[PDB]
Every structure is written in structure tokens, then in C-alpha cells.
Amino acid sequence: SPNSQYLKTRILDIYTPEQRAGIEKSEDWRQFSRRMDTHFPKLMNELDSVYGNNEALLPMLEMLLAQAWQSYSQRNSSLKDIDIARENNPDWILSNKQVGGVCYVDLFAGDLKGLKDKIPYFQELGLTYLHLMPLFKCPEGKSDGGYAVSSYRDVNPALGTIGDLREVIAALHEAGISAVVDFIFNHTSNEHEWAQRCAAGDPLFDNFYYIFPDRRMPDQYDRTLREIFPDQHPGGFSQLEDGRWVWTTFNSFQWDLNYSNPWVFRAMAGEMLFLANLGVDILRMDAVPCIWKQMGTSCENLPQAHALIRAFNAVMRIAAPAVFFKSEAIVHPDQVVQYIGQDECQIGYNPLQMALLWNTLATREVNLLHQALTYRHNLPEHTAWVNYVRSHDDIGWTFADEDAAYLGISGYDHRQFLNRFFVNRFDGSFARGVPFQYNPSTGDCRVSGTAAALVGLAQDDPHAVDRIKLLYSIALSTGGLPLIYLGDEVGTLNDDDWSQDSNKSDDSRWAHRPRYNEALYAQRNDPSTAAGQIYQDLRHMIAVRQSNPRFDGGRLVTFNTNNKHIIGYIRNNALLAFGNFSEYPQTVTAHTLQAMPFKAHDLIGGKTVSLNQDLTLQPYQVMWLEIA
């Protein structure tokens, strides 16, 4: 294997001797050179573990490093300052100062210029982080809401231009907001140039995707493949018009990229550098589990998939140190946590906490949540969860069957109940959700619907507003970077138009993808409306989280409340949080509270609380008690 020093001399070979001497003394070069020395051994090792003695590895690698140099040389100085800042501040992601939001540009604000106009509102709300949903060119009509990319460079013209995007990013930065975008690196749309050319047999795009002559290997693979959109097609494969079969983990119009081809890595790394130089702070690594395939396995979470991501990480450490990764792994909790690492994805979605928030509202019993917060919350240094309540996607019940078994819960039966409950097919349910991808062969089903629809706000359940506050309180205080699905903060309901729209009707996720509700946002400063109650409560919790250092970091220790309905945990040995998941008053006893200080201030209600006597929480009440 070649070394950093050797490879740097060859990067410099593009320059004439005179030009070369100038480059070698430049500040950009010395920074690049230093970072090469620190981070290149990781890159080489990770790529070696995947590609081994592959003839194309060394030529690919030199090509990639030449690009890395050109990209960093072109990188704006403002971004270079952030590179240095985060390089020396790895835990910026763990600060209680951070509160994130997510929205679709078109649904929330029409276009990119419109989103820019909404930035003062994001400041009002206190956001330091904004995820904008897929922005780039996609086929018309069905495109998995932008997740089938036809071009990584051309902005969706209904959103605006690449120029509008730069303005947006610069304005976010000016407002002290990090820009967060999707890195859709597992698959492209079938109308992407690479896809067309690969299928047409253009030798330049040989082995860019997984194309088979017939069903022989697909049938073999499908033996161990989990079905993601079983409504759309069975197994992992779709048929071309010429009779061949292609790997399509998601929709038929999403073709999986072939990472067993090193040229695919290089291609996507080039795309990553492009996004980096737009000033993107965090890349959402879409569908991380799927980037490696192997016969007889689930083709998810394979070691090579982890290595490739660690290789991408090293490319950023070299050529755009500011750029951090957010892992999307909606999988078994044992698998979820493995993507999270300083050298892998510094942050990642926390589906376990999210799913269990909803579970607990349904069952009124904190057992599963308590278990998760006890044994699966704490993370390695310099990493953090992204804690969320809702997202653009359905809710999956991705808790561990093995964990549930310890509690005498059958995962299968439990998911049956949760699915019935949240789609309003269980007696007395407050939830108004919609099924998503019910799979007759497995009994699996997921749930669509907005946070407000799922807590009972559509029918004016008098408990709805408090339920929203409770769920968000937990995402805001457990430790990690909290993410608000924008619209939730004013109690936005389902889009009921989705089901009769032929572009959307086979995808119930559109139920929870409504447009900016003008009427609700106009009500946000009125405490007699649901919109205003929700907004005020959330804004207060955000204000508390950001100003109070007791929320800092990602670590917690759970507190045994001795009440099956009340969750308890401690932050920094100074903040004691209680959340009542029962719709009735629930008590933490004086006996349970003996070790606590006599009095403690509650940050939620703003009152002093007596802890040397029984503590009764009202239905869905949250308390944030300063115990030190």
C-alpha cells in the first residue's frame, strides 16, 4: 500500500516546476498536506478492507485525492474557517445550544426564495440546524418525494436555481443556522444519466448498478431480503423493459448503486465534495445499511458498508473538515448504533427512542422506553443521537424483540396492537393514523400521520396538546440533537387530499406531508388556540434547553420512579426529568424521592416543588427539576 507522502508528490505532478513551488508554500496546501498525513491512513485501510488487491483501487484513489485537492483549493475561505473551528471542536454537535428543524422547501415555503423569507421565523423558533428535503432534479410524478435523484447537480426547477440554494445556505449561516441536506448515495433514479448509460452498455458505466440476465440470482438474493416497499414490488429486484433484472431495494425507479465497483465510490465522493463546497454542514446519509450486498445475507449492515462510510468520513476530514454525517439506519437497535462513531457518522437518527415515545403513549407504560434509555442511550465520545418525534416517513416499530422478551412482551403481538391502535382500529384509541406498507406475508405494517393526528388533535382530544409537549420534552432533554418536524409546533393535521391524488395515493406517507398551514401559523401567539398552546410550550422548552447548561452533552442516567406510567432520568447529575404517560394523575412517592433535595425548581411550570412528600403529576405532565 502507498503512503500519504508518496501520493502527495503525484498530486503535485499536474503543476510545472515554477507553479509547483508556489503550491507547496501556500496555506491551502500545507493544511491539506497536514490533514492528509493525519487522515489518509484511515482512508487507505478502510478502502483496502473492501476492495483489497483490486486493480482499480490505486488509480481510483489517486484520482479521488487529486479531486480532493482541487475541491479544497476551490473551497471558500469562510468554509475553511468553519473547517478549522469544528476540527478543534468535535463536540459542537453535543451542545444543548443545538435544536434542529426539518421541512420540504415547496410544501413549507413554495420555493427557495420563499424558504429564505422564512429564515427570520426559524430564528424566532430558535433553530440552529435546518434539514431541507431533497432539492435536486427528479422524475416528474412519482419520485419517492425527491429520493429518486435524476441529477445531483441540477436543482429541482420548481424550487429554484443553484444560485438560489447558495443564497439560502449563506442566509442560514448568517442567521447562525447549519445547513443540512440529503446525501442520497445508495441509489439513483432510473432516469439518471449513469443508470441509462450503464443499462445501454456504455463501458464507462460498466458495473455501476446490479443488473442480472434473469431471475436466477435475484431469487437467490430474495431468500434473505427484507421488503421495504412490498406494495410496489416483491423482494429486492425490478424488471427492465428488455427483460433483465436490476437491484431496486426501494421503488422500481430507484436503482441501487454498485459499491463493489471502486469507481462508484469515487463518483459519489465527487458528489460529496460538490455538496461540501456549497457550504453544507451536515450530510444526511440516506439508507446507510444498504450500500453492500452479499449472497445469503440481508444485504444490510454488512462490515463493508460500515468501512465505506468510514472511508467517506476520512475524505471529509481531508478536504472539508466542517462536513459532518447524519446516519439514517432504520434497523434493529444493535445495528443502528454501529453507524455512530467519530470516524463514521458523528450523529445518527434515534428511531428506537422515537418509536418507543409512541409505544408509551399507546400502552401508558414506560417499561420499553425506560429499558432503552437505560441500556441504549449513551454513546461513544464525540457522537450524538438525533432525537425526533416525527419525520417525513412512516413510523416503524423498530424495538428489539430480544429486549421486549426480557420484559415478557412478544414483539410480534405487540406490533399487531400498536398498528391497530395508531390507525384507529382499537377500542378507545385517540390516534388517527393511516396504514403504510402492510405486508401480508410478514404481518408487518407501519404507520403514517402527523404528530397532532396521532395524539388526537383532529377530534379535539383535550389531552392532545399535552401529549405533543410530553413527546417533544423527551427529545429535547434526553441528550442529543433534537429535531422538530416543522409544522408540529402549531399542531398541523394530516393532508386529507393525498389519498385521491394519483401521484400520491399509493404512498400514505403523504398524509403526514401537508403544506404550510397559514391559519395555524397566524394563531401561534394566541394562547387560547391549540396552535398557540403547542407553540408556546415548545418554544419555552427550546428556550430552557438552549440556556441551561444542565442539558449539555448526550449522556443520561435513568431514574427508577416506581410508577409504571412515569419516565424518569437525570442529566449531568443536576436535572431530574419526570414525564407522566398516563391520562390520569400519577404519583412518585416521598419514599422514592428520599435521596433528592428537599426543594427543587421546576423549569416547565416555573414553580418550586417539594420532594420530601408525594409528587403527583397531572395527566401528561412533564417536570424538569433542578437538583443541583
Side-chain angles (χ1 to χ4, degrees), residues 1-4 6-24 26-112 114-136 138-240 242-535 537-606 608-628:
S1 289
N3 67 70
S4 172
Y6 166 79
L7 289 161
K8 281 185 292 185
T9 66
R10 282 161 67 84
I11 294 170
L12 295 169
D13 281 344
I14 61 166
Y15 306 102
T16 65
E18 181 174 6
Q19 293 174 337
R20 193 194 181 105
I23 299 300
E24 296 207 60
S26 69
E27 170 70 2
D28 286 354
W29 181 258
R30 78 160 275 274
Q31 290 276 54
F32 180 86
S33 184
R34 162 181 76 81
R35 285 160 181 162
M36 274 287 284
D37 289 354
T38 304
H39 305 284
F40 174 81
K42 286 173 303 180
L43 178 64
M44 187 64 253
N45 177 247
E46 302 293 355
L47 292 176
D48 174 73
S49 75
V50 176
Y51 301 113
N53 285 144
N54 199 310
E55 149 278 320
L57 170 58
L58 174 75
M60 181 280 281
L61 182 58
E62 303 203 58
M63 190 173 290
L64 174 60
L65 291 166
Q67 288 174 68
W69 166 239
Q70 292 306 147
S71 183
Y72 185 71
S73 186
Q74 294 162 6
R75 187 158 174 82
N76 198 294
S77 307
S78 292
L79 306 177
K80 280 166 175 152
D81 294 334
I82 309 167
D83 292 336
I84 290 160
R86 285 166 189 172
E87 198 165 37
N88 301 112
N89 185 24
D91 288 5
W92 71 282
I93 51 169
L94 276 154
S95 175
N96 56 304
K97 290 277 184 293
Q98 296 285 334
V99 168
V102 53
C103 67
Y104 290 84
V105 174
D106 59 344
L107 298 182
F108 195 82
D111 57 17
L112 285 171
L115 189 287
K116 202 165 76 57
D117 293 332
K118 256 67 192 285
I119 292 179
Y121 170 68
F122 301 148
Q123 288 175 111
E124 183 196 320
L125 181 57
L127 300 189
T128 59
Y129 167 128
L130 182 67
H131 175 205
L132 298 176
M133 294 300 292
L135 298 170
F136 290 91
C138 51
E140 270 155 48
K142 298 178 172 201
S143 75
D144 190 8
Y147 280 102
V149 182
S150 298
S151 165
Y152 290 111
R153 307 304 177 93
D154 303 339
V155 172
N156 183 341
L159 305 185
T161 54
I162 186 76
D164 297 315
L165 180 52
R166 293 195 162 95
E167 262 173 274
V168 166
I169 293 164
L172 286 170
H173 280 187
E174 140 87 15
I177 301 169
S178 289
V180 183
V181 309
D182 293 88
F183 185 58
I184 309 169
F185 78 132
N186 180 251
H187 46 270
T188 75
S189 81
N190 59 351
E191 291 170 13
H192 194 286
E193 175 189 319
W194 308 348
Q196 300 177 151
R197 294 178 71 172
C198 176
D202 178 340
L204 183 63
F205 288 88
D206 186 58
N207 222 24
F208 255 65
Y209 301 87
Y210 303 86
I211 304 174
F212 307 91
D214 49 43
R215 283 295 309 188
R216 188 183 63 88
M217 300 198 57
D219 286 351
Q220 220 90 101
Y221 280 123
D222 279 353
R223 291 176 187 178
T224 54
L225 290 189
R226 185 166 59 88
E227 291 186 317
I228 307 298
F229 302 134
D231 287 349
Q232 260 55 240
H233 65 84
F237 306 85
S238 300
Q239 196 169 23
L240 308 190
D242 65 29
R244 286 180 304 172
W245 294 81
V246 66
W247 212 308
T248 65
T249 298
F250 303 99
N251 290 278
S252 286
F253 46 80
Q254 284 156 310
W255 292 11
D256 291 44
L257 284 164
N258 196 332
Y259 282 86
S260 72
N261 182 357
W263 298 110
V264 166
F265 181 85
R266 176 264 182 182
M268 289 313 299
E271 295 310 313
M272 182 177 288
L273 282 164
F274 168 81
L275 291 171
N277 275 10
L278 292 184
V280 172
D281 298 91
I282 299 176
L283 286 173
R284 183 188 172 275
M285 311 297 278
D286 183 76
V288 287
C290 306
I291 65 176
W292 199 256
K293 324 289 192 198
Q294 176 61 231
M295 186 60 70
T297 76
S298 67
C299 304
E300 293 176 76
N301 318 304
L302 290 177
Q304 290 88 349
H306 290 277
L308 291 169
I309 295 153
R310 291 194 297 260
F312 280 115
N313 180 297
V315 173
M316 296 298 89
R317 303 286 72 68
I318 292 163
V323 178
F324 273 48
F325 293 166
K326 174 170 71 175
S327 166
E328 195 226 358
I330 316 304
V331 291
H332 196 284
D334 290 348
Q335 311 308 330
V336 172
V337 71
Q338 298 181 114
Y339 295 94
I340 308 184
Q342 182 172 31
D343 300 339
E344 196 158 340
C345 298
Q346 308 90 343
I347 70 182
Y349 285 99
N350 192 358
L352 185 59
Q353 190 191 290
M354 181 280 296
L356 293 184
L357 284 187
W358 291 107
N359 171 75
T360 311
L361 275 184
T363 69
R364 282 82 164 164
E365 299 189 7
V366 304
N367 48 12
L368 281 169
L369 181 64
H370 175 80
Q371 191 186 44
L373 294 184
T374 301
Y375 300 104
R376 290 180 190 279
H377 182 83
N378 285 343
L379 286 163
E381 292 176 77
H382 317 308
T383 65
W385 290 114
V386 178
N387 300 322
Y388 61 114
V389 179
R390 284 303 283 105
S391 76
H392 68 288
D393 278 325
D394 55 307
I395 300 162
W397 309 114
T398 53
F399 64 80
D401 281 352
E402 304 84 347
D403 291 358
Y406 277 98
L407 305 182
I409 298 166
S410 166
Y412 186 93
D413 298 353
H414 205 70
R415 292 187 186 91
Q416 290 283 311
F417 158 74
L418 290 172
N419 280 129
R420 289 185 193 278
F421 182 92
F422 283 103
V423 306
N424 188 36
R425 290 288 296 272
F426 184 84
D427 176 61
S429 180
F430 51 74
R432 300 292 179 273
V434 184
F436 183 67
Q437 297 305 315
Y438 167 62
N439 189 331
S441 81
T442 66
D444 188 76
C445 188
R446 296 105 81 170
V447 170
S448 291
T450 71
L454 298 173
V455 297
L457 194 64
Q459 72 274 21
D460 303 296
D461 190 316
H463 285 304
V465 164
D466 285 337
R467 285 167 182 150
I468 296 158
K469 179 194 195 180
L470 175 64
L471 300 170
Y472 273 108
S473 86
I474 290 167
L476 293 167
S477 56
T478 39
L481 205 159
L483 185 66
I484 299 143
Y485 192 71
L486 291 167
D488 286 1
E489 79 275 17
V490 288
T492 302
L493 301 178
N494 289 350
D495 171 290
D496 275 310
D497 306 315
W498 81 270
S499 56
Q500 291 181 356
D501 180 331
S502 64
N503 276 171
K504 292 179 177 197
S505 68
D506 68 341
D507 189 347
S508 79
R509 290 178 295 179
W510 292 102
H512 58 250
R513 294 169 185 180
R515 306 192 73 87
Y516 185 95
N517 191 316
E518 290 288 357
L520 295 185
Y521 277 96
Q523 291 182 316
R524 78 184 179 264
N525 299 311
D526 181 2
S528 295
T529 71
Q533 284 150 28
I534 294 157
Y535 183 82
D537 287 333
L538 264 62
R539 190 61 198 83
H540 173 68
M541 293 191 297
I542 294 163
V544 168
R545 164 184 171 85
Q546 296 178 319
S547 56
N548 193 316
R550 297 167 181 82
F551 296 85
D552 203 9
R555 299 282 173 91
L556 73 82
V557 178
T558 52
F559 180 83
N560 290 320
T561 75
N562 295 314
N563 185 317
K564 68 194 185 175
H565 306 292
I566 307 169
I567 195 72
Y569 51 91
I570 300 173
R571 309 297 324 291
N572 294 296
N573 207 36
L575 193 296
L576 173 60
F578 287 134
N580 182 15
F581 277 82
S582 164
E583 71 266 55
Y584 307 113
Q586 294 296 339
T587 287
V588 182
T589 65
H591 190 283
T592 299
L593 296 160
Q594 287 175 84
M596 293 302 152
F598 250 43
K599 299 277 170 71
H601 173 77
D602 167 37
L603 297 160
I604 299 299
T608 303
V609 178
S610 290
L611 300 173
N612 69 329
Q613 63 179 45
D614 282 358
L615 175 53
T616 298
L617 303 181
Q618 288 294 303
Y620 304 110
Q621 187 174 355
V622 46
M623 266 164 55
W624 288 348
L625 301 164
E626 294 176 321
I627 54 168

